[PDB]
Enzyme design. Structure first.
Site, short mmCIF file in Angstrom:
data_model
loop_
_atom_site.label_atom_id
_atom_site.label_comp_id
_atom_site.label_asym_id
_atom_site.label_seq_id
_atom_site.Cartn_x
_atom_site.Cartn_y
_atom_site.Cartn_z
N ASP A 1 11.51 50.03 2.69
CA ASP A 1 11.48 51.32 3.08
C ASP A 1 11.83 52.34 1.83
O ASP A 1 11.92 53.89 1.53
CB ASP A 1 13.01 51.81 3.65
CG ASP A 1 13.38 52.95 4.13
OD1 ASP A 1 12.20 53.61 4.72
OD2 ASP A 1 14.29 53.88 3.97
N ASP B 1 15.25 48.82 -0.82
CA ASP B 1 15.43 47.57 -0.29
C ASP B 1 14.76 46.84 0.22
O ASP B 1 13.32 47.62 0.24
CB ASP B 1 16.04 48.03 1.02
CG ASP B 1 15.56 49.55 2.09
OD1 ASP B 1 15.20 49.20 2.03
OD2 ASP B 1 16.33 49.07 2.85
N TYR C 1 18.61 54.40 9.98
CA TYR C 1 17.93 55.81 10.60
C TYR C 1 17.98 55.30 11.99
O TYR C 1 16.79 56.24 12.99
CB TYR C 1 16.20 55.39 10.68
CG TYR C 1 16.25 54.90 9.45
CD1 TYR C 1 15.82 56.58 8.05
CD2 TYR C 1 16.04 53.73 8.48
CE1 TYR C 1 15.55 56.47 6.77
CE2 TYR C 1 15.80 54.77 6.63
CZ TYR C 1 15.54 55.63 6.17
OH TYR C 1 15.32 55.60 4.73
N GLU D 1 18.85 56.44 -5.10
CA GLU D 1 17.74 55.91 -4.52
C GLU D 1 16.51 56.75 -4.40
O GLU D 1 16.18 57.56 -4.76
CB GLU D 1 18.20 55.39 -3.12
CG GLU D 1 17.45 53.87 -2.50
CD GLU D 1 18.59 53.22 -1.16
OE1 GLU D 1 19.30 54.23 -0.69
OE2 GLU D 1 17.64 52.39 -1.47
#
Ligand code: CA
Length: 454
Positions: free
Chosen positions: A56, A59, A206, A422
């Site tokens: 994703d 990670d 999510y 990120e």
């Protein structure tokens, strides 16, 4: 080349980013030589090959909601701007990624009403800091079924497969037909269940915040475009009544963004193009007006240097996605003349912001002073389960759009800062469509045959 940035290079790298997120047994078309086979036992806890797809973010969890959102968005980019992809030499690469991810969704769909929506445990995966290829922790797989359902993820996956069936039909008509059949099945699964009660393993990561009615319209739109079956248009249109509202009201919420959670604005835009109806123009223009010149006297926050700033987490993701919608709607003959210019100009400004108009690129491996320490395990490549070792990333994650600046344009570049630094599948998704439009408009040549080879 007529624009402030090399948009072809940016497009090329923004597509390439998805290579670096690849999970499973790497096929021979992969350009880079620093990623290797990983997560090869995915699915085996449930007797299936669930290898493939994309990790994703920074990670190694496979979270199929943002993954399938990304899938749909990448096909939408081709659906709108195929000729930009052809001219830049990038069509074959984006199709490769669209085929890759949708092949994984087919794997995840082993009975009509059984859909695997996750591989990896968030807590176990996030507790270790090292490259994908050497993971040792358990990676459980998770499924929804009729008695334990996940309409939001199922429907978003249906959308991805239906869109892919359109754009991959020329290159691989057999696979396209397979995708369409799975899309139709998964849509029925989502519709018959109308529930996220079994969608649990993504909780805290999510969750379905907006519910699944936006996905039910969005998936039905794509399935209408793929089938020309009018029942899908009826459903897409119907489910509008249950789209996410400003809380306490009957007004559709125009003050967020098209994103992995909420796809109603893109659904509205495509329903405006398909049907020409004012209802849908009113939806999408409220949203786009709020992002630009104002709607009913309120506009989104803007940073001093011109970023439309929705939230501090993934600000660039949101602006760049909205940019893509702005472009698609302003390209439409039904857009009011003046809003065409406002919306296009807005889209330009947001892409140029990402690419460095404020003095610094926010795209890894591109432009001026780009991020060098994105929050990404595999790019960093620690041998010591430590963010500090090595001090510099051993691999360049070309194309990765970082989360973005503060509301004051500030930014640092810290490996530990997963808010601003990120990178993620969904961050690059709409960005790639918007960059294709900018390349169409202003050019900039891709680096010929560029491969990320160490
Ligand atoms: Ca939703």
């Amino acid at each position: 080349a007529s624009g402030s940035f090399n948009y072809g290079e940016a497009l090329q790298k923004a597509i390439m980013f998805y290579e670096f997120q690849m999970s499973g047994k790497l096929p021979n078309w992969v350009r880079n030589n620093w990623r290797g086979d990983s997560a090869l036992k995915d699915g085996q806890d449930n007797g299936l090959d669930l290898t493939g797809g994309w990790f994703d973010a920074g990670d190694h969890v496979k979270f199929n909601l943002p993954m399938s959102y990304t899938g749909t968005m990448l096909s939408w980019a081709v659906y709108e701007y195929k000729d930009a992809f052809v001219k830049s030499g990038q069509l074959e690469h984006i199709l490769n990624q669209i085929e890759w991810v949708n092949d994984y969704f087919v794997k995840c769909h082993p009975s009509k009403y059984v859909y695997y929506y996750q591989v990896g445990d968030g807590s176990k995966d996030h507790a270790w800091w090292g490259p994908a290829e050497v993971m040792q922790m358990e990676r459980p797989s998770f499924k929804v079924t009729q008695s334990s359902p996940g309409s939001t993820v199922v429907a978003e996956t249906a959308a991805s497969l239906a869109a892919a069936s359109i754009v991959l039909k020329d290159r691989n008509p057999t696979k396209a037909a397979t995708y369409l059949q799975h899309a139709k099945e998964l849509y029925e699964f989502a519709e018959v269940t109308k529930s996220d009660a079994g969608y649990t393993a993504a909780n805290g990561y999510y969750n379905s915040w907006s519910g699944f009615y936006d996905e039910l319209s969005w998936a039905a739109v794509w399935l209408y475009l793929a089938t020309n079956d009018s029942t899908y248009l009826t459903k897409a249109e119907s489910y509008v009544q249950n789209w996410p509202k400003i809380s306490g009201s009957n007004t559709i919420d125009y003050k967020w963004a098209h994103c992995w959670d909420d796809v109603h604005n893109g659904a509205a835009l495509l329903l405006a193009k398909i049907t020409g109806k004012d209802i849908y123009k009113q939806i999408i223009e409220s949203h786009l007006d709020y992002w630009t010149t104002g709607y009913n006297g309120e506009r989104i926050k803007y940073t001093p240097k011109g970023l439309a700033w929705l939230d501090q987490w993934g600000s660039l993701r949101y602006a760049t996605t909205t940019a893509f919608l702005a472009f698609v709607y302003s390209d439409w003959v039904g857009c009011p003349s003046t809003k065409k210019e406002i919306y296009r100009k807005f889209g330009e400004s947001q892409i140029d912001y990402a690419l460095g108009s404020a003095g610094r690129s926010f795209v890894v491996g591109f432009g001026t002073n780009p991020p060098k320490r994105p929050h990404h395990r595999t790019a960093h490549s620690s041998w010591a389960d430590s963010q500090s070792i090595p001090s510099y990333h051993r691999h360049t994650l070309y194309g990765a759009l970082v989360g973005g600046p503060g509301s004051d344009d500030s930014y640092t570049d810290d490996i530990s800062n997963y808010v601003n630094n990120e990178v993620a599948c969904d961050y690059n998704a709409g960005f790639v469509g918007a960059l294709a439009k900018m390349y169409q408009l202003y050019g900039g040549n891709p680096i010929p045959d560029f491969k990320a080879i160490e």
